[PDB]
C-alpha cells in the first residue's frame, strides 16, 4: 500500500464475530479503514485473545503480513498506539 511501511486505520467491525472455530482466520479477521486513503480493507490479528482486546473505532497501526484464507495482506500491529503483543503478554494496559 502507498509507499509507507505501516498504516493507521479505523476499526469498522470485527466481521467474523459469529464464529464457530476459535483459531479460524475468519474469526481473526477485522475490517479496518486505513485513514489517509480512507479505504476499507481487512486484516488479521495473530491471536483470538488479542481480538478480544481490540474494539471498534480505535486507531490501528498495521503492516504487511508475509510468510485457510490466503490473500489478506495486512496484519494489525498496534492499536491506540500500544503494542498488541505487549498486551498479549500482559505488559502494558490499553489507553481508551
Amino acid at each position: 500500500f502507498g509507499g509507507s511501511s505501516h498504516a493507521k486505520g479505523i476499526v469498522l467491525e470485527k466481521v467474523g464475530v459469529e464464529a464457530k472455530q476459535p483459531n479460524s482466520a475468519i474469526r481473526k479477521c477485522v475490517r479496518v479503514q486505513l485513514i489517509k486513503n480512507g479505504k476499507k480493507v481487512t486484516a488479521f490479528v495473530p491471536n483470538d485473545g488479542c481480538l478480544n482486546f481490540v474494539d471498534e473505532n480505535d486507531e490501528v497501526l498495521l503492516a504487511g503480513f508475509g510468510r485457510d484464507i490466503p490473500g489478506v495482506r495486512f496484519k494489525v500491529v498496534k492499536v491506540s498506539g500500544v503494542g498488541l503483543l505487549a498486551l498479549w503478554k500482559e505488559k502494558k494496559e490499553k489507553p481508551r
Binding site: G2, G3, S4, S5, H6
Partner: peptide, 10 residues
C-alpha cells in the same frame, strides 16, 4: 527516496 519514505512515516 529515504526522505520520502521517512516523510510518509511522519
Amino acid at each position: 527516496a529515504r526522505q520520502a519514505a521517512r516523510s510518509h512515516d511522519i
